[PDB]
A paper describes a structure:
We also solved the crystal structure of BmTrxR, being the first crystallographic structure of a TrxR from a nematode, which, surprisingly, is a fusion of a large TrxR domain with a Grx-like domain at the N-terminus lacking a typical Grx active site motif. Helminth TrxRs are members of the high molecular weight TrxR subfamily and are selenocysteine (Sec, U)-containing homodimeric flavoenzymes. They transfer reducing equivalents from NADPH to their flavin adenine dinucleotide (FAD) cofactor and, subsequently, to a pair of cysteines located at the si-face of the isoalloxazine ring. From there, electrons are transferred to the mobile Sec-containing C-terminal redox center of the symmetrical subunit, that, upon reduction of its Cys-Sec motif, reaches the solvent-exposed surface of the enzyme transferring electrons to the incoming oxidized Trx.
Expressing isoform D of BmTrxR, containing the shortest N-terminal extension with respect to the TrxR and Grx domains that are identical in all three isoforms and utilizing a more recent method for Sec insertion capable of yielding 95–100% of the wild-type form, resulted in a protein producing crystals diffracting up to ∼2.5 Å in C212121 space group. Upon model building, BmTrxR appears to be a fusion of a Grx-like domain (14–102) with a TrxR domain (103–598), reminiscent of the W-shape architecture found in TGR from platyhelminths. Protein dimerization takes place through the TrxR domain, while the Grx domains lie in the upper external arms of the “W”. There are 3 protein subunits in the asymmetric unit of the crystal lattice; 2 of the 3 subunits, subunit a and b, belong to a physiological dimer while the third, subunit c, forms a physiological dimer with a symmetry-related subunit belonging to an adjacent unit cell. Unusually for this class of proteins, the last four residues of the Sec-containing C-terminus are here visible in the electron density, thanks to a particular arrangement of BmTrxR subunits in the crystal lattice. The last four residues (-GCUG) of subunit b have been detected in the X-ray derived electron density because they are trapped between subunit a and subunit c belonging to an adjacent unit cell by a disulfide bridge (2.05 Å) between C596(b)-C22(a) and a selenenylsulfide bond (2.1 Å) between U597(b)-C22(c), respectively. Three cysteines are found in this domain, C22, C82 and C83. While the last two residues are buried, C22 is exposed toward the TrxR domain, about 30 Å apart from the last visible residue of the C-terminus of the TrxR domain of the parent subunit [C22a(CA) - E586b(CA) = 29 Å]. C22 is likely to be a low pKa Cys; it localizes just at the top of an α-helix belonging to the TrxR domain of the same subunit making polar interactions with the carbonyls of F456 and L455 at the top of this helix (the sulfur atom is at 3.4 Å and 3.8 Å from the two oxygens, respectively) and it is within 6.0 Å of the positively charged nitrogens of Arg251 and Lys130 side chains.
Numbering used by the authors:
A (entry chain B): 10 to 586, 595 to 598
B (entry chain A): 12 to 587
Write the structure that this text describes.
């Protein structure tokens, strides 16, 4: 009674024009008639009836029949006729310079580039770094490599190593008596040397695999045409049968006087030629807290200014516990939003400047304008998609209010040969390994015709605060909101990592884990949360439990490794709030 | 009717006979029990339930008899118990519901769980001193002379390497050599142990467990004789016994061994820096101890018969050897033939031992000596069960001194159970001892079918670079399924924490995933050489409880940046 999904998508990938049809074929000639206009031959497949629902779910279209052009699902006749009518289909059916043009040389872009090339495709990768307002710019590899996960983790490690020196003394290492300072210049140089090695590793990796790299900023000027502008101002034209947008985000600045003149962002922090000194971190994002955390850990006076709550979107119980701990470690939290930044001093080549930060502070007997002076202000309120100058209007790629591209999965909802992955895809969790997986999987779908989907649910994270926060699945609140207080079991414990047992570390009273369970479905695990050293290393493997609908009973029959923090997930009995014969 | 209903009844009733159809001599049971004014309860088991119930209790055929919630077998085994007088003494009231011989990982965990289920329990614990005179408090091997002190000294070693990283991340540490003071480390470790000793001793009182610091021996069918430090002998009776007595370090039949060589029982309370150290043996204990002693700046030699880590993946063992060699540990394939004491330890200084070896040169074989401050005898661990009176209760032991189980029930005595290192075939790990204890207590006093899972147990060897594993070695998988049906996926990686350093570890971190090719790359085992191997291995180990495939590892989204995410992006196949 027909053929199946894999056979359909293989044909779809192999053939120039494929019509996939079910029970009936009204307008088959209208399609064949429409393509005959461009001397194109239309291939056919009768799909098995008990396979259609699966095929439709995968491509994200409501009903049959389906039309593919050069291995891209277009929809039905309605969508094809729109493409023909606009002249886009005429230009689409032409030969183009590249099988795929990738706009962005970051996590997703590079991963997609390597995977497309492994599948024997001609690919162009475009990457350009518009400087920050402070003038800061960098090499290939994107946010993660240059101004994100990598530099952040290295400075976090600089901070942990500070706490490790004190433990070393308590385990009996005879460290001479002096106060011990962190030299910012050595740290920043060590970080920038590593980044430099990655910049060059990716640049080489692209050459070794015959990916055409262009250090040019790309904009759509045709249906199948990017105009790309290099550093010196040279403008070239690049054509492709398909486009992938993996452009990412840049730090958000608020509409406040001085913000842009006075406040660095994460784009600037990791190549600062000076110790940032007394620092104000503005915002409640994980970036704000991670940066506040390590700056404290390397000995700076650190303040964090937040609108209301920390880590909006994370479990607020865990957020509060991070707040308690970072407060005990000497970070100062104030609930205020600056109304003006005034530059008192400019940075020299080796010393920080000075900014006067203005706030409206509340008495009981009235309201006061208040100022406080900081060496450095880090604007860390969020990250925005900077897609206004991409010419997505020219290719008719629908965007959300926020500037992100709206997907039918990774396919532009409105344009079948433009795809988006990574931070710029509306609703995509903003993580490197998601950008990487989305890229690699998309490239296998497009050029192999496989049914593999990226799994965007139950993604584990770690917030690399001074005491790390690992999580996967629902917050306690989301579980209770969705299923009812009455149907949720929360199993939890405190614990002292054995490494801390011999020390008088503040961490000894803050390590906590909890497991959130659906009571009415055998304590199905909905989420887990842990506050510990090495939270990332613990959370990663436990996260696979959610792919198999793991129950509490599965955590309980898993034998621990002793002595570790991780084994704590194995012996939870405490709930948060005899043969009787 | 069904299994849960059978085992509930079995736990609730004094004497229960479980049957299928019209079993032969169900009368001669009721007749036998009528002798002791006992009522024999009955249950007709559903046919669809029998094979399940028999698998659980570990008996071949169906007419089953329970006594005080203990599965005895069939009429044959009951008659044996009656004939020996044991059944008569069993049906009497006794002082305790359960007597536990051993105050270690298993014993204490069983004690806490029995008491939570409302039972009167006595826990017996005594520590016979080492040959060097060393002794310690409650909590067993792990607390006093095992996992806990070992991991703390391992961390002392790691913190040594962390000081050097601190300089490369820009911490201005005053210049010149930094020494580890052994006395501060040993005191810090012993202070922690002291807190655990006391925590367990209090924990037992708080829960009304009777603790007796006495060494126990069976002198009746249902009677232990227990001897305290001062030499006082008391008698303890119970309706059931749990043996959770553990092991002690093995010494070889070699002149001087016992006089000259410390064991792990002595190492963690040594009143001196051990100095130039010889570690004898290939066990994880030998290598872990060799590793940290090197990490705190000692001249360390390891002497092995042939291979390291017998039982572990030899590819990973070789990689551990290469790394520890690069970190300055000296490996020689020699077995000492004599130890001669040159000096006794005195005044917080180590002694000196002359170690004799047969080495061959271009002419033949010659006796050779080398001098060490300290020799750690770490060849293995044996069950010291000769003096337990297991002959009196008729608890069968294996050649090695371990108790032979029908699961955790003595194969030969239905009211005696064993868990932990002393149960024949039980992996020798704390969390196994703990789970076996807790689960057994729920079986015995709740009548649940819950079994401890003894397969696919994750471990970590806390060598200077940690080795984490779960499931088959490459070799076991190839031996069992054929090289043609095994995919080995692997990678090297540099922990980001090392990227900025000149560490030796940067060339030794490796992971591999062992897959059954003919069953969609079903994961049979995984192995990783990395910092925090324990923390990474624990959660990945749950994948094997669900018959995880490579595809499950591939659709799991990594946490960046971590070592663990490496299990998410393996593409390279090891070819051989
Ligand atoms: C401070 C910080 C810390 C982070 N920490 C973590 C973490 O610990 N773990 C984690 O998983 N994630 C972390 N992230 C997020 C992670 O970096 C992002 O999710 C990921 O980098 C997004 O990758 P991408 O490929 O989608 O975009 P990007 O990596 O940003 O790459 C987009 C690239 O395209 C370039 N580009 C933009 N427009 C154009 C154009 N028109 N033409 C050509 N090129 C263009 C951009 O300049 C950039 O080079 C962090 C982010 C930040 C800012
Ligand atoms: C150096 C070393 C490192 C280890 N590292 C690890 C590790 O990292 N992870 C891990 O999981 N496992 C580790 N182990 C193993 C772990 O210690 C054991 O597996 C575990 O302690 C076994 O617990 P148990 O209850 O079986 O026995 P034990 O903990 O040995 O308890 C037995 C107790 O019973 C006492 N006893 C003996 N006979 C009698 C008697 N007749 N009457 C009364 N009391 C008696 C003993 O003296 C002792 O007090 C390590 C072991 C060693 C030696
Ligand atoms: Cl780190
Ligand atoms: Cl924290
Ligand atoms: Cl530590
Ligand atoms: Na025990
Ligand atoms: Na004791």
């Amino acid at each position: 009674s027909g053929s199946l999904a894999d056979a359909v998508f293989k044909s779809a990938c192999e053939e120039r024009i494929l019509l996939a049809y079910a029970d009936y074929n009204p307008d088959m000639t209208k399609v064949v008639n429409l393509f005959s206009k461009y001397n194109e031959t239309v291939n056919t497949v009768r799909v098995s009836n008990d396979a259609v629902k699966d095929i439709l779910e995968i491509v994200g279209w409501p009903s049959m029949p389906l039309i593919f052009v050069k291995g891209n699902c277009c929809g039905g006749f309605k969508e094809l006729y729109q493409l023909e009518e606009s002249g886009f289909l005429n230009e689409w059916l032409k030969e183009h310079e590249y099988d795929l043009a990738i706009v962005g040389g970051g996590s997703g872009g590079l991963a997609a580039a390597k995977e497309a090339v492994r599948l024997g495709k001609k690919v162009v990768c475009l990457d350009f770094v518009k400087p920050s307002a402070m003038g800061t710019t960098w090499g290939l590899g994107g946010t993660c490599v240059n101004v994100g996960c990598i530099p952040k983790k290295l400075m976090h490690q600089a901070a942990l190593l500070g706490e490790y020196i004190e433990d070393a003394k308590k385990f009996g290492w005879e460290i001479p008596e002096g106060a011990i300072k962190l030299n910012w210049h050595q740290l920043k140089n060590a970080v920038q040397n590593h980044i430099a090695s990655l910049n060059w590793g990716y640049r080489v990796q692209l050459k070794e695999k015959s990916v055409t790299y262009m250090n040019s900023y790309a904009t759509f000027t045709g249906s199948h045409e990017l105009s790309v502008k290099n550093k010196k101002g040279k403008v070239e034209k690049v054509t492709a049968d398909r486009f992938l947008i993996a452009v990412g985000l840049r730090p958000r600045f608020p509409d406040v006087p001085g913000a842009l003149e006075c406040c660095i962002s994460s784009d600037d922090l990791f190549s600062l030629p000076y110790n940032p000194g007394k620092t104000l971190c503005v915002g409640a994002s994980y970036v704000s807290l991670e940066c506040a955390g390590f700056l404290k850990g390397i000995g700076n006076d650190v303040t964090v200014m937040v609108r209301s709550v920390l880590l909006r979107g994370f479990d607020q119980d865990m957020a509060e516990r991070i707040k308690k701990h970072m407060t005990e470690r000497g970070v100062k939290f104030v609930q205020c939003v600056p109304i003006k930044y005034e530059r008192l001093k400019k940075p020299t080549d080796s010393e920080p400047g000075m900014i006067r930060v203005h706030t409206m502070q509340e008495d009981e007997d009235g309201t006061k304008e208040v100022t406080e002076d900081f060496n450095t202000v880090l604007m860390a309120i969020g990250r925005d998609a900077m897609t206004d100058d991409l010419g997505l209007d020219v290719v008719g790629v629908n965007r959300a209010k926020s500037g992100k591209i709206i997907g039918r999965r990774e396919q532009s909802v409105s344009c079948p040969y433009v795809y988006a992955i990574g931070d710029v895809l509306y609703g995509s969790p903003e993580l490197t390994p998601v950008a990487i997986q989305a890229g690699k999987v998309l490239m296998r779908r497009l050029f192999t015709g496989s049914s593999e989907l990226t799994e965007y649910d139950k993604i584990p994270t770690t917030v690399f605060t001074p005491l790390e926060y690992g999580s996967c699945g629902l917050s306690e609140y989301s579980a209770i909101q969705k299923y009812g207080k009455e149907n949720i079991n929360v199993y939890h414990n405190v614990f002292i990592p054995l490494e801390y047992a011999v020390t008088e570390r503040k961490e000894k009273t803050h390590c906590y884990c909890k497991l959130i369970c659906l009571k009415n479905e055998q304590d199905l695990i909905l989420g887990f949360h842990i506050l510990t050293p090495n939270a990332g290393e613990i959370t990663q493997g436990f996260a696979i439990a959610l792919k198999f609908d793991a129950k509490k009973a599965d955590f309980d029959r898993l034998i621990g490794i002793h002595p570790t923090v991780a084994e704590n997930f194995t012996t939870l009995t405490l709930v948060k709030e005899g043969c009787x014969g």
